[PDB]
Amino acid sequence: KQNSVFYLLTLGRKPYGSYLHIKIELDEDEKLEKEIYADNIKLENELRQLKRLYEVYQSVEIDDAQKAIQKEALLTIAKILSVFDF
Amino acid sequence: EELLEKQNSVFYLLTLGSYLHIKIELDEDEKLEKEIYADNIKLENELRQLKRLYEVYQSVEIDDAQKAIQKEALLTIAKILSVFDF
Amino acid sequence: KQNSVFYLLTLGRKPYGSYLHIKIELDEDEKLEKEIYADNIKLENELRQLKRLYEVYQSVEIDDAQKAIQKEALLTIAKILSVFDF
Amino acid sequence: EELLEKQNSVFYLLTLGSYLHIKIELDEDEKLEKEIYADNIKLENELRQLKRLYEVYQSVEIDDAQKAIQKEALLTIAKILSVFDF
Amino acid sequence: EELLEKQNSVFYLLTLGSYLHIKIELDEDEKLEKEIYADNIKLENELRQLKRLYEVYQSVEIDDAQKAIQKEALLTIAKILSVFDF
Amino acid sequence: KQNSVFYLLTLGRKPYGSYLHIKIELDEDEKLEKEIYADNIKLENELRQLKRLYEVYQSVEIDDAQKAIQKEALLTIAKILSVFDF
Amino acid sequence: KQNSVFYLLTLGRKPYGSYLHIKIELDEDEKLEKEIYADNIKLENELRQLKRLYEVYQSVEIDDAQKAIQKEALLTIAKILSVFDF
Amino acid sequence: EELLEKQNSVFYLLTLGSYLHIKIELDEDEKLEKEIYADNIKLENELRQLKRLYEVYQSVEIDDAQKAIQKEALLTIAKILSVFDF
Amino acid sequence: EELLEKQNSVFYLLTLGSYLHIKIELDEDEKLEKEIYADNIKLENELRQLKRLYEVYQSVEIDDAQKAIQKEALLTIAKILSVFDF
Amino acid sequence: KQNSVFYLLTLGRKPYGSYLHIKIELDEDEKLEKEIYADNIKLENELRQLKRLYEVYQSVEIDDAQKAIQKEALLTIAKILSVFDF
Amino acid sequence: EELLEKQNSVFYLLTLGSYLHIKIELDEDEKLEKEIYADNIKLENELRQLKRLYEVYQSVEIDDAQKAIQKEALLTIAKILSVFDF
Amino acid sequence: KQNSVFYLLTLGRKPYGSYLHIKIELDEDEKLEKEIYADNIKLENELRQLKRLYEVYQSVEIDDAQKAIQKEALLTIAKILSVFDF
Incomplete structure (x- = not known):
């Protein structure tokens, strides 16, 4: 199986504080992007x-949110990366 | 209006008992790659x-080690991704 | 503001056990429906x-999953209702 | 292949400090309705x-009370919905 | 010098493994009666x-339920009496 | 066996607060009566x-107080009743 | 004030074990006496x-049991004495 | 049928802030007497x-001390009596 | 410049499963001596x-007992010495 | 085996407080002596x-400190004695 | 009779609020040196x-990092030495 | 101030297991050396x-063991080093 x-x-500094532009390309099909302070x-x-998010993702039933939780995990992981990479 | 400070890719x-191959390209310069059970x-x-790893990363004196711990984090994060993506 | x-x-009995057909019409626009054992x-x-689901719903960022978590809560509440209503 | 045992609507x-009106139609026969802060x-x-309410509902001798507790649950569930829907 | 507000009878x-019959006349109008192991x-x-029952009785919205919980309390109190009286 | x-x-209101007149007819032979604030x-x-009172009543030796503890339980139960019945 | x-x-030995005959003369008016194994x-x-017994004796209301609890304390104290005196 | 082993009197x-006089006659041979606040x-x-005192009394090697601890117990027991008798 | 208040010898x-003889000369006047397993x-x-022993020694009314507890302490201290010295 | x-x-009083002169003759060969406040x-x-000191004495390796810990225990025991003997 | 596997120097x-200079020669090849408050x-x-550091050192995948954590340990150990030696 | x-x-392997020869030159005057399994x-x-060892070293009184505890710490630290350096 594969997953990319x-x-x-990108950390930008604005007059008010630093902002983290997060861009995430899940499986070369979905782009997600958000700008956190x-x-x-x-x-x-975040841990x-x-x-x-795991507790919910493994107990979730609909044919819907198992992708909509996966994405929130991916954003949450972006924030974790930002901590280690700066 | 805002100024870019840094970027991180x-x-x-x-690529997937189960046995997992991990490839990570940090910042388009380092490749890290490993196999695991x-x-x-x-x-x-993993959490x-x-x-x-954070507790150590933020108390570590050497300029270098920080990077050697960053990489471990990145691998640890791979395993976490594998959980959510499969 | 309004919310319907x-x-x-519907509880059906099959040869294997009872099954709970859940139909939920959120705001007269979305139908959700699922069949739980x-x-x-x-x-x-369920509590x-x-x-x-609340802990996540109030800390969730995307313009996406604040509806995709709401729905899982609604299903979860269906199951709670089934307990009191039978 | 399966047989319907019961149905529950x-x-x-x-309809919404904040002050909340609740209307509940149980089983298309009972209306319950209340206002709250x-x-x-x-x-x-509420959880x-x-x-x-469950602990009592399942230990309650009277055939009747069960229904008077069911209704309380239903109201309690309204408040829970109000949290998620607003 | 003092004024009577209400009276309660x-x-x-x-009447008594062991199997117990309970008869309760509340306020000389309601009879309640049950058999138990x-x-x-x-x-x-029972305590x-x-x-x-109190926790619910004092948080219960319906004018009615209060009475349906009162009765449960009364039965619960019967069992407590049976302990002390035999 | 029998026990009545x-x-x-009776709740009376005096200028200072409400008072609970308790009258208890144990086995149609003993009257007990007390006026609590x-x-x-x-x-x-009270629970x-x-x-x-039970811990003591079941570990008590004399041919005396197994009735003199029973009575205190009965009063204590009166107070409990007052809570549910008003 | 006075209290005697x-x-x-008296510890007697019988074929089955030792028995403690307790005789207690409260205020030169009441004799209490019991034979414990x-x-x-x-x-x-006993502590x-x-x-x-204190918790109850100080929260007890009737004009009755404040002497009928005192006596049980006195017996209980006899047993304590027996431990130190043999 | 039974044989007396020992007797203890x-x-x-x-005799009674409050100030308390204690007189104890152990075994009609020793008098002990003290005043306390x-x-x-x-x-x-005191419990x-x-x-x-028991923990020590039963681990104490000397034949004598046992008696010097017994006496302390007896005084301690006086104070306990004073609580219940006044 | 300083004044001697007391002296204690x-x-x-x-002298040593293992079986231990203890001899203690307190203050060159009392000998205490015992055998133990x-x-x-x-x-x-022992700690x-x-x-x-301290808790009792400092709450003990009798002038005497203090000495009978002191001796127990001294024996207890012998055993402690035996641990460190062998 | 033997151990003396x-x-x-000696407790001396100085203008500033009492001082405890400790003299300890281990095995009639070593004198140790110290003056504690x-x-x-x-x-x-001290307990x-x-x-x-025991935890260390039984886990200590060198051919050195198993006597240099023994001595500190001996001083510590002197202080304990002072508590019981004054 | 025995074979040397490795050696470590x-x-x-x-060299010493207080401010501390640390020099460490690992294995006569690396010098590490730092100043601290x-x-x-x-x-x-530090313990x-x-x-x-151990928890990470023994779970760290990279051949390298182990060395970058070893060095941190060595510095941490310097501080510990400073405590005992001054 | 200075401290070296x-x-x-040296880790040697014998037929029975590995042995750690520890040599420690405190201040270029004292050699300590031991062979641990x-x-x-x-x-x-060891932590x-x-x-x-610190708890004791800072509460120790004699003009003796403040060096004899320091040494045990030094050995204990050797063992810690062995863990990180092999």
């Missing part, structure tokens, strides 16, 4: 967020 | 590993 | 599931 | 209320 | 049942 | 009081 | 028994 | 004191 | 014994 | 100190 | 740092 | 051993 995840992360990202929270 | 190519990949362990 | 939720719940529904689990 | 019409609706409380 | 007729009447359980 | 307990409870009766306390 | 308590304790008296229990 | 004469006599402390 | 002669001498127990 | 420990303890000796600490 | 030169060197922290 | 610690560690060294134990 491209993470492109970077300064208040705390690894522990917990992942714990919960 | 992480390319995750993941996927049966005993347990999210909680804890990240918690510890 | 229609819950239509009814016999192994435990209120406590916890709601706790988590 | 619950119609939730919810929405500022201090806290999900955890616990359900836990207790 | 509760008549407990209890007395071996597994455990005071702690906890009262704790819960 | 008659509970007659009603406003500071807390179910939890604990019962727990203790 | 006379404790006369001595071999299974455990200080901790707890006292703890409870 | 303990005579407690107690009764405001801060707290049952729990714990007994627990400790 | 303690002479420990210890050394296999089950466990430091923690706890000291903790308790 | 002589404890000679006596007023701040707390049994619990813990012993606990630790 | 670590040379610690430590010694007031807030707290042994417990915990070692616990974590 | 030279660690020379290497295979049963557990970091956690605890250090914790205790």
Whole structure:
């Protein structure tokens, strides 16, 4: 099986604080992109967020949200990467 | 209005008891790649590993090590992705 | 503001156990429908599931999943109703 | 192949400090309707209320009370919906 | 010097593994009466049942239910009496 | 075996607060009667009081107090009734 | 104020075990007397028994049992004495 | 049918912030007598004191000390009596 | 410049499953001497014994007992020495 | 085997507080002697100190400190003696 | 009779609020050297740092990182030495 | 101030297991040397051993053991080094 995840992360500084532009190309078909305020990202929270997103992703029934939770995990992982990569 | 400070690219190519190949291109310069036994990949362990890698990454004196821990994080993050994507 | 939720719940018995056909008309626009095996529904689990779905729904960023989590809550609430209504 | 045992319709019409009107049509025969102060609706409380209502509902001797507790649950569930839908 | 506000009569007729008949006349208008298996009447359980019945009785919206919970309490209290009186 | 307990409870209001006149006819032979100040009766306390009165009643040796503890339980139960019946 | 308590304790040995004849003259008016099997008296229990008897004695209302609890304490204290005096 | 092994007489004469005189005749041979400040006599402390005196009394090598601890117990028991008798 | 208040001599002669003879000369006036089974001498127990002996020694009314507890401490201390010296 | 420990303890009072002159003759060959300020000796600490000194003494490897820990235990025991002997 | 597998030389030169210079020669090939603020060197922290560095060192995939963590340990150990040596 | 610690560690393999020859030159004056069996060294134990050795080293009084504890710490640190360096 295959899975490609491209993470492109850009930290921009604005007059108010630093912002993290997150671009994520899931399987070369879906682009996701979001701009978080970077300064208040705390690894522990994000690791917990992942714990919960898994708890839900494996107990979720619809033919819908098993992709819509996967994406939130991917964003959450972007934020984690930002912590280690800067 | 805003100024770019840095950019970070992480390319995750993941190819799947179960046995997992990991390819990571950090910043289009480093390739990292490894094979692992996927049966005993347990999210909680990997989240804890990240918690510890962070604890060390932010208390580590050497300019270098930070990078050698960053890479471990990146691998640890691969395993986490494998959980959500399969 | 307004919100309509229609819950239509039908318990059918099959040779193997009872099944709960859940039909949910959110805001007279979306129909959701699913068929759960009814016999192994435990209120406590479902109350916890709601706790988590809220934890995620209020910390979720995308313009996507704030509806895709709402729906899972709605299904989870159907199962809770089934417990009180039979 | 399967046989219908029962059907249950619950119609939730919810209309919104904040002050909340609740209308519930149980089984197209009973209407229940109430007004409440929405500022201090806290999900955890309402989940616990359900836990207790269940504890009583399944230990309650009277044929009747079960129905009078069912209705309380239904109202409690309205408040929970209000949290997720607004 | 003082004014009577209300009066309440509760008549407990209890007649006795062991199997227990309960007759209760509430307020000289309602009779309640039931049979139960007395071996597994455990005071702690019955005290906890009262704790819960109260928790619900004082949070219950319906004018009616209060009465349907009151009756359960009265039965629960019968079992407690049976413990002390035999 | 038989046991009759008659509970007659009257709430009177005096200038200072409400008072609960308790009249209890144990087995149509003993009358007990007491006037408690009603406003500071807390179910939890009274349930604990019962727990203790049982602990003592089942470990008590004399040919005396197994009736003199039974009576205190009966009063304590009156107070509990007052909570549910008003 | 005055209070006299006379404790006369006699340990007799019978074919089956030792028995503790307890004679207690409260205030030179009341004699209490009981014969306990001595071999299974455990200080901790008796100290707890006292703890409870106090909890009850100070929360007891009737014009009755404040003497009928006092007596049980006195017996309980006899058993404690037997432990230290043999 | 049974044989007397020993007899023990303990005579407690107690005479009452509050200040307490204690007279104890052990076995009609020893008199012990003391004065104490009764405001801060707290049952729990005295029960714990007994627990400790026992712990030592039953681990004490000297033939004598046992008696010197017995006496302390007897005084401690006086204070306990004072609580129940006043 | 300083004034001597008191002097205390303690002479420990210890002679060694294992079986231990203890000789103690307190203050060159009292000899204490005992034999014990050394296999089950466990430091923690002996430290706890000291903790308790102190608790009693400092709450003990009799002028005498203090001395009878002091001696027990001294023996307990012998066992502790035996642990460290062998 | 043999072991002699002589404890000679002298409490002197100086203008500033009491001082405890400790003289310890281990095995009639080693004299140890020290002057502690006596007023701040707390049994619990010293019992813990012993606990630790044992933990170390039984896990210590060198041909050196198994005598240099023994001595510290001996001093620590002097302080304990001072507590019981004054 | 025995065979040498490896040898490791670590040379610690430590030179001393307080401010600490550290020089370490690992294996006579690498020099590591750093300056630190010694007031807030707290042994417990440094022991915990070692616990974590080990946890990572033994779970680290890269052949290299192991060495970059080894060095951190060595520095952490310097601080520990400074505590004991000054 | 200055302090030199030279660690020379050699792992030899014998028929029975690996042995760690530890040579430690404290301040170019004292040599310490010991041969531990290497295979049963557990970091956690050794970190605890250090914790205790500090607890003792800072509460130790004699003009003796503040060097004889320092040495045990130094050995204990050798064992820790062996863990990171092999």
